[PDB]
Design a protein around this ligand. Structure first.
Ligand SMILES: *[C@@H]1O[C@H](CO)[C@@H](O)[C@H](O)[C@H]1NC(C)=O
Ligand SMILES: CC(=O)N1CCc2c1ccc(Cl)c2Cl
Length: 351
């Protein structure tokens, strides 16, 4: 099945990196008032030099020129209850990542600018055009996303909520689901701008990157890079946000320059990383954090398989839905592994 259909943005001034129109894939579900808007990930580029390289061999992340007319919804975007016990009947939207800016930019390609970085505006424009296609009648809009899309959720969920309030739709409940987008600005295991802190600092300047207002007001000018880190930006958010995060995320380990017989130094580094991640989730009431070495989960077809403390992610998300109607009997929403080494959870993806 190729069930989500491409719509290029009617406002063609909201563009991918190269000035081609951004867009979204839609599969409508009549009668359902649930809308799932999923932000694709795919790293980023923070200067002309690496953006030019990304344009040569990763061009679909920078242009809509070669996008197919349809995409198959998989995992949480699947309409089959067997693949998606959580939201199989929802209206499904897949928003391709073609701005290379962690969904934070609001700058057009112009005289001074070889590339457009419009991720924040892309989300705004998708939401605006969807209101005329059924979203106006929604009761829940779940803004989900994986990897850089997961960080995009944290950066944009409150802006979507404010956008709908100002447009006159206060009844739509905007919620966030951030998958694999909860990073630590930690010490690298070996020094190498791959390090998470420096990459984001350069990005905002290059991108015209914007961050949630309450977080911006805490860290102030020149320090907005802090708001790309989940444990710093999450406490400032008003919309409900469910956090999915492997304790030993492969992209975290990459920017940490960890490449997998492990000796004491690396063992301690890996164990400290998991404990740090676990600590940052202690006060996140809706979270699913398995002790696995892996990367993304929610649009993979076997996303149903992993469990924490006996509860799957689709179940935990259903429990979260119920909690948003005191804790529920047999329906937990805070699921963080406590064991300290990759794959100490037997349900981790096999690879
Ligand atoms: C098109 O999008 C741009 C970027 O946000 C915005 O400035 C402009 O007002 C939009 N125009 C229309 C007609 O929607
Ligand atoms: C793969 C990816 O997308 N990565 C890895 C590091 C990172 C990403 C996305 C957002 C932020 Cl803040 C950070 Cl540190």
């Amino acid at each position: 099945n190729e069930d989500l259909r491409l719509h290029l943005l009617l406002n063609t001034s909201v563009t991918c990196n190269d000035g081609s129109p951004a867009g979204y894939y839609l599969k409508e579900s009549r009668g359902s008032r649930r809308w799932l808007l999923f932000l694709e990930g795919g790293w980023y580029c923070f200067n002309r030099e690496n953006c030019d390289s990304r344009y040569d061999t990763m061009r679909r992340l920078m242009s809509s020129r070669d996008w197919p007319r349809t995409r198959t919804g998989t995992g949480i975007l699947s309409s089959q209850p067997e693949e998606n016990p959580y939201w199989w009947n929802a209206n499904m939207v897949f928003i391709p990542y073609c701005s290379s800016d962690v969904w934070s930019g609001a700058s057009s390609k112009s005289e001074k600018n070889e590339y457009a970085f419009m991720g924040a505006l892309i989300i705004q424009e998708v939401v605006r055009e969807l209101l005329g296609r059924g979203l106006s009648g929604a009761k829940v809009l779940l803004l989900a996303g994986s990897s850089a899309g997961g960080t995009g959720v944290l950066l944009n969920v409150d802006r979507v909520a404010e956008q709908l309030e100002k447009l006159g739709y206060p009844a739509i409940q905007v919620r966030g689901l951030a998958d694999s987008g909860w990073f630590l600005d930690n010490k690298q295991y070996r020094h190498t701008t791959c390090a998470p802190t420096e990459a984001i600092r350069r990005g905002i300047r290059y991108w015209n990157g914007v961050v949630p207002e309450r977080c911006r007001r805490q860290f102030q000018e020149g320090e907005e890079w802090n708001c790309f880190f989940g444990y710093k930006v999450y406490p400032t958010l008003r919309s409900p946000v469910f956090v999915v995060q492997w304790l030993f995320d492969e992209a975290q380990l990459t920017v940490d320059n960890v490449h997998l017989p492990v000796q004491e130094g690396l063992r301690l580094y890996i164990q400290n990383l998991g404990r740090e991640l676990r600590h940052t989730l202690k006060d996140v009431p809706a979270s699913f954090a398995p002790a696995c070495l892996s990367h993304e989960i929610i649009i993979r077809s076997h996303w149903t398989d992993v469990q924490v403390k006996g509860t799957s992610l689709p179940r935990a998300l259903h429990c979260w839905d119920r909690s948003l109607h005191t804790p529920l009997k047999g329906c937990p929403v805070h699921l963080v592994d406590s064991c300290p080494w990759p794959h100490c959870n037997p349900s981790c993806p096999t690879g």
